[PDB]
PDB file of C-alpha atoms in Angstrom:
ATOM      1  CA  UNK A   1       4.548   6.329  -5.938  1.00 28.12           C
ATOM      2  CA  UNK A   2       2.491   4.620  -2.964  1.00 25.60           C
ATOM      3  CA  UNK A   3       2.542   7.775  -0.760  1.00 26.70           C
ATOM      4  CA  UNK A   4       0.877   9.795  -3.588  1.00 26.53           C
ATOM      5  CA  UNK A   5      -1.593   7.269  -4.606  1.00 25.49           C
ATOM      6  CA  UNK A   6      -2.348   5.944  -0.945  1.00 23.62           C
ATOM      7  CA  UNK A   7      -1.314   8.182   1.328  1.00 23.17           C
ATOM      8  CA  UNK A   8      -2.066  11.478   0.356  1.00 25.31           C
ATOM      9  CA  UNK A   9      -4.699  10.518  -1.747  1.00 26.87           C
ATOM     10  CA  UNK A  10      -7.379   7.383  -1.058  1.00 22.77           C
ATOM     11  CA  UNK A  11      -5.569   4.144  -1.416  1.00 21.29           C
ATOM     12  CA  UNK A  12      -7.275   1.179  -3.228  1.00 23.23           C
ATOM     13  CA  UNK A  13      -6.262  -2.563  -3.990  1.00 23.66           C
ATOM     14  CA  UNK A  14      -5.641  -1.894  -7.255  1.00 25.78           C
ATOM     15  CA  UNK A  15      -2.594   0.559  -6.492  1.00 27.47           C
ATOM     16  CA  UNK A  16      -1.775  -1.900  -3.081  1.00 29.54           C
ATOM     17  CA  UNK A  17      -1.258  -4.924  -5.415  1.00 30.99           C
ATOM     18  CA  UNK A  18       1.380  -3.264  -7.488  1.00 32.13           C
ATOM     19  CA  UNK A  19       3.436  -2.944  -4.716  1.00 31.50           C
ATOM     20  CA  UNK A  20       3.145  -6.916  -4.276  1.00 29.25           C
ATOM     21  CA  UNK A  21       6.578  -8.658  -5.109  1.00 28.07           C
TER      22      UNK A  21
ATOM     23  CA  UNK B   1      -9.681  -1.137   5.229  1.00 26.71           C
ATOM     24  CA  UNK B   2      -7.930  -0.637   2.339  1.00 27.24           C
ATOM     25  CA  UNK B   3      -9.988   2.694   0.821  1.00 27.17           C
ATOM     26  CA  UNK B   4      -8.725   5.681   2.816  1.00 25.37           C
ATOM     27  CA  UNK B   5      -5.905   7.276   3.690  1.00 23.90           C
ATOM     28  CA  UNK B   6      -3.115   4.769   4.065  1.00 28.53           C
ATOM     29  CA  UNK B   7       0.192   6.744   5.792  1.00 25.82           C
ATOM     30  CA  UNK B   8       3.459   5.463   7.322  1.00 24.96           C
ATOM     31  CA  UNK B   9       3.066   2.310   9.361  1.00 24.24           C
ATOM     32  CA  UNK B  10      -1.345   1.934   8.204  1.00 25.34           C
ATOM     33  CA  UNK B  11      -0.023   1.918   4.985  1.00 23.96           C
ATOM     34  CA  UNK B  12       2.985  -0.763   5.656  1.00 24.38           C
ATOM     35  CA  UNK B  13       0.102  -2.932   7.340  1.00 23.51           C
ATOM     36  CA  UNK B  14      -2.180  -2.981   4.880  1.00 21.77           C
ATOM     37  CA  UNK B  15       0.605  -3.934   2.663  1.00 25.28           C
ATOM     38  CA  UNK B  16       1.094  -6.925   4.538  1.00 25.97           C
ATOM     39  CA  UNK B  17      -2.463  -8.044   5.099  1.00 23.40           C
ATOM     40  CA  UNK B  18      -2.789  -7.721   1.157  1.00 26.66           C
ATOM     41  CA  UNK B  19       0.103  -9.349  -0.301  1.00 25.70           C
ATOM     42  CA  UNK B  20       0.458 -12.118   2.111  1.00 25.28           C
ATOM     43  CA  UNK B  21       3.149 -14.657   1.528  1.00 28.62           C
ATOM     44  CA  UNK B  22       4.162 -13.016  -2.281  1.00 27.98           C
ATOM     45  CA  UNK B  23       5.397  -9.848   0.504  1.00 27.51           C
ATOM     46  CA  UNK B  24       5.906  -6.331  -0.828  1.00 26.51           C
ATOM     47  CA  UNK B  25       8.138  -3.412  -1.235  1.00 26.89           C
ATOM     48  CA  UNK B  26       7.787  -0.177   0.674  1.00 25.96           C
ATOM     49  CA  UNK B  27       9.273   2.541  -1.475  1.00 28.03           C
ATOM     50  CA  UNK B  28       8.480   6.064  -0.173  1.00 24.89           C
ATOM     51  CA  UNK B  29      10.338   7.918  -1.744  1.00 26.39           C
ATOM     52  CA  UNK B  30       9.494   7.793  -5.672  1.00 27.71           C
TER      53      UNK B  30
END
């Protein structure tokens, strides 16, 4: 999930926007 | 701001800076 991809790995706006309702 | 290391409230900020008005879901735990 986010923490994995963002978190404890470098984030990018790819992965941000799928957390976008 | 949004290529590093995003934790706990960073991350909930960029969040909001990125989605704007469509807002966003915070799900930690997956």
């Amino acid at each position: 999930g986010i923490v994995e991809q963002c978190c404890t790995s470098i984030c990018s706006l790819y992965q941000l926007e799928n957390y976008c309702n | 701001f949004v290529n590093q290391h995003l934790c706990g409230s960073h991350l909930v900020e960029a969040l909001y800076l990125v989605c704007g008005e469509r807002g966003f879901f915070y799900t930690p735990k997956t």
